[PDB]
Every structure is written in structure tokens, then in C-alpha cells.
Scaffold this active site. Structure first.
Site, mmCIF file in Angstrom:
data_model
loop_
_atom_site.group_PDB
_atom_site.id
_atom_site.type_symbol
_atom_site.label_atom_id
_atom_site.label_comp_id
_atom_site.label_asym_id
_atom_site.label_seq_id
_atom_site.Cartn_x
_atom_site.Cartn_y
_atom_site.Cartn_z
ATOM 1 N N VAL A 23 -109.965 2.410 39.212
ATOM 2 C CA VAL A 23 -111.184 1.756 39.673
ATOM 3 C C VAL A 23 -110.830 0.535 40.512
ATOM 4 O O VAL A 23 -109.893 -0.206 40.190
ATOM 5 C CB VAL A 23 -112.086 1.370 38.483
ATOM 6 C CG1 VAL A 23 -113.355 0.679 38.963
ATOM 7 C CG2 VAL A 23 -112.423 2.605 37.659
ATOM 8 N N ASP A 128 -116.585 10.334 25.856
ATOM 9 C CA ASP A 128 -115.742 9.161 25.650
ATOM 10 C C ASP A 128 -116.599 7.900 25.624
ATOM 11 O O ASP A 128 -116.260 6.883 26.239
ATOM 12 C CB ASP A 128 -114.655 9.062 26.724
ATOM 13 C CG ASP A 128 -113.560 8.079 26.360
ATOM 14 O OD1 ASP A 128 -112.980 8.209 25.263
ATOM 15 O OD2 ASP A 128 -113.278 7.175 27.174
HETATM 16 C C1 LIG Z 1 -112.465 -1.025 33.080
HETATM 17 C C2 LIG Z 1 -112.736 0.465 33.282
HETATM 18 C C3 LIG Z 1 -113.124 1.095 31.945
HETATM 19 C C4 LIG Z 1 -111.482 1.150 33.819
HETATM 20 C C5 LIG Z 1 -113.884 0.653 34.273
HETATM 21 N N1 LIG Z 1 -114.228 1.873 34.898
HETATM 22 C C6 LIG Z 1 -115.453 1.633 35.838
HETATM 23 C C7 LIG Z 1 -116.084 2.760 36.652
HETATM 24 C C8 LIG Z 1 -116.174 2.756 38.036
HETATM 25 C C9 LIG Z 1 -116.762 3.837 38.680
HETATM 26 C C10 LIG Z 1 -117.246 4.917 37.952
HETATM 27 C C11 LIG Z 1 -117.140 4.909 36.570
HETATM 28 N N2 LIG Z 1 -117.625 5.994 35.745
HETATM 29 S S1 LIG Z 1 -117.850 7.577 36.329
HETATM 30 O O1 LIG Z 1 -116.800 7.976 37.265
HETATM 31 O O2 LIG Z 1 -117.673 8.565 35.264
HETATM 32 C C12 LIG Z 1 -119.496 7.689 37.077
HETATM 33 C C13 LIG Z 1 -119.620 7.858 38.443
HETATM 34 F F1 LIG Z 1 -118.504 7.950 39.223
HETATM 35 C C14 LIG Z 1 -120.878 7.944 39.014
HETATM 36 C C15 LIG Z 1 -122.007 7.851 38.219
HETATM 37 C C16 LIG Z 1 -121.882 7.676 36.851
HETATM 38 C C17 LIG Z 1 -120.624 7.593 36.278
HETATM 39 F F2 LIG Z 1 -120.498 7.420 34.930
HETATM 40 C C18 LIG Z 1 -116.561 3.834 35.934
HETATM 41 F F3 LIG Z 1 -116.457 3.824 34.575
HETATM 42 C C19 LIG Z 1 -115.837 0.242 35.739
HETATM 43 C C20 LIG Z 1 -116.978 -0.478 36.460
HETATM 44 C C21 LIG Z 1 -118.052 0.201 36.932
HETATM 45 C C22 LIG Z 1 -119.051 -0.461 37.565
HETATM 46 N N3 LIG Z 1 -118.982 -1.774 37.715
HETATM 47 C C23 LIG Z 1 -117.914 -2.453 37.239
HETATM 48 N N4 LIG Z 1 -117.836 -3.893 37.403
HETATM 49 N N5 LIG Z 1 -116.918 -1.790 36.611
HETATM 50 S S2 LIG Z 1 -114.875 -0.422 34.769
#
Ligand SMILES: CC(C)(C)c1nc(-c2cccc(NS(=O)(=O)c3c(F)cccc3F)c2F)c(-c2ccnc(N)n2)s1
Ligand SMILES: [Cl-]
Length: 255
Positions: A23, A128
């Protein structure tokens, strides 16, 4: 359609990685989160697998689910989402030790119950869910995301995992119960078990469920019952999120 041309995406500093991708904070018509997949020159069996993941994220439009915004293929495979300005629920409970009142605690649970209700309605399993995946946007709005090792939220049945498909709706309900434990106690479960391999072992065979007697004095009685029902051993004896959401939607009004 949702294919975003890359050169517009200014990739910034690295935030980290978890169960999926790496990320980054970025910019695309404002602040966005950019999830790199580190796949160079995708084979058609990987491009379709990428579009299958995009197709699942695309199906979510809810104020409590992390807002999918776009995806790129050149130069890399990546997913652009909204940027949450704030800190994760895990961070607030076990890093900052934020002094949330009970009203705020139940509110965070209610917003999470709706997002989970929305996900299950769209036939999407999180697999998860945990306090680190509950982002408190502007310290107000819950944003669920991040769809190895993090066993405290794993149900007993996820320890088989070699016959059929152990991840179910009920397994998501169990993880929600553990989040409720954190909210109502301020601690992670199994505080006195200093070895993971035995936690995996105990929960797996079922002789171990969190101590519901660490809950704060002002924890509502119905919240205690709901925690116990979500953390029940058998899959089929756990309540669905429509009932979970409805139960909390009554507690907030009483409080
Ligand atoms: C610290 C850690 C746990 C590694 C993080 N992962 C994301 C993050 C960033 C992008 C997507 C997804 N989750 S995802 O990939 O599974 C997803 C999408 F890509 C689209 C829509 C929903 C969704 F859950 C994330 F968790 C974080 C994150 C996401 C949004 N804003 C901020 N400030 N941080 S943080
Ligand atoms: Cl669409």
C-alpha cells in the site's frame, strides 16, 4: 471502464503491506491510497485474475466499506482507493489508548456491523477481518478494507482448512466477535497465553474462547450476550449480521 491512466497517479511514500499487496499513499484528483501488486507483464491468466478481484471490489458501494476508485495495468497492476485520514481501530485501542466513551464504542461496532451486513448481502466474505482492518476515517466513519499470521481473530473451523471451504459467513461473524471483545475490554484476547502455537491449538480443538469477564463495568448486558453468541464454537450456532446489526441498532437507542 475503471481503468485509470497511470501517469496521473503520483505515487508517494510507502505505508506498508499486509494480507494483500503493498500500500502507498498517492494522488489522483486528491489523496488516494495505491495498492501495488508487484506483477510485471501479466500473463492472461493473471490479467483475468486481476479483473476478477477488481470485479469483486467494484461491486461495493457503501459508506462503511473502503471506496474502490480505479485500477491500472500499465506500468504495474494496482488498485486506487479513497484515502482514510485517521488511524486504525487496533491503533486507537492498543497504541494510542484513546479514551472512547461507551457511546462511541457501540457506534464503531454499529458501523462495522452495517459494512459486514452489506458485504454479506453482496455475497462477499472478508476472510481477514480484524481491528487493524477497521479504519476510523476522520475519527468518525468506519472504513473496512484489506480483504500468514494473525490468529486472534480466526474461528476454530478455519484451523481445518484442507477438506472443503472453511471461510464462511459464520467465520466472519466470529472475527466480529473478537473485535467486540477488544471494544468492550480494551485488550486483545488471550492476554496471558504467551505462545501462539498453543492458541492455534486450543481454539482449533475448541477448549479456549476469550474471557468475557474482562469487559468494562459499563458494558451493556445485551452486548455481553451478543459477544457470546458470535464467539460460539459451532459455525451454525452463530447469528447472521442482519440479527447482529438489529441487536446493536437496539442497544444504541437504549444507551
Ligand atoms: C496498514 C495496512 C493494513 C497494510 C493497510 N492497507 C490499506 C489498503 C489500501 C487499499 C486497499 C485496501 N483494501 S482492498 O484492496 O481489499 C479494497 C480495495 F482495493 C477496494 C475497495 C475495498 C477494499 F477493501 C487496503 F486495506 C490501508 C489504507 C487504506 C485506506 N486509507 C489508508 N490511510 N490506509 S492500510
Ligand atoms: Cl461500475
Amino acid at each position: 471502464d475503471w481503468e485509470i491512466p497511470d501517469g496521473q497517479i503520483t505515487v508517494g511514500q510507502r505505508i506498508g503491506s499486509g494480507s494483500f499487496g503493498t500500500v502507498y499513499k498517492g494522488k489522483w484528483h486528491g489523496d488516494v491510497a495505491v495498492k501495488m501488486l508487484n506483477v510485471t507483464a501479466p500473463t492472461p491468466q493473471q490479467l483475468q485474475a486481476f479483473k476478477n478481484e477488481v470485479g469483486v471490489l467494484r461491486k461495493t458501494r457503501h459508506v462503511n466499506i473502503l471506496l474502490f476508485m480505479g485500477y491500472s495495468t500499465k506500468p504495474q497492476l494496482a488498485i486506487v482507493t479513497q484515502w482514510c485520514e485517521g488511524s486504525s481501530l487496533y491503533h486507537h485501542l492498543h497504541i494510542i489508548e484513546t479514551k472512547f466513551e461507551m457511546i462511541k464504542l457501540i457506534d464503531i461496532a454499529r458501523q462495522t456491523a452495517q459494512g459486514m451486513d452489506y458485504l454479506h448481502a453482496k455475497s462477499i466474505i472478508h476472510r481477514d477481518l480484524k481491528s487493524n482492518n477497521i479504519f476510523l476515517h476522520e475519527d468518525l466513519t468506519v472504513k473496512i478494507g484489506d480483504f500468514s499470521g494473525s490468529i486472534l481473530w480466526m474461528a476454530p473451523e478455519v484451523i481445518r482448512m484442507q477438506d472443503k471451504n472453511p471461510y464462511s459467513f459464520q467465520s466472519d461473524v466470529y472475527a466480529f466477535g473478537i473485535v467486540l471483545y477488544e471494544l468492550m475490554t480494551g485488550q486483545l484476547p488471550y492476554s496471558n497465553i504467551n505462545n501462539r502455537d498453543q492458541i492455534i491449538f486450543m481454539v482449533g480443538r475448541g477448549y479456549l474462547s476469550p474471557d468475557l469477564s474482562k469487559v468494562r463495568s459499563n458494558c451493556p448486558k445485551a452486548m455481553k450476550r451478543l459477544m457470546a453468541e458470535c464467539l460460539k464454537k459451532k459455525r451454525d450456532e452463530r447469528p447472521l449480521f442482519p440479527q447482529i446489526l438489529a441487536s446493536i441498532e437496539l442497544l444504541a437507542r437504549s444507551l
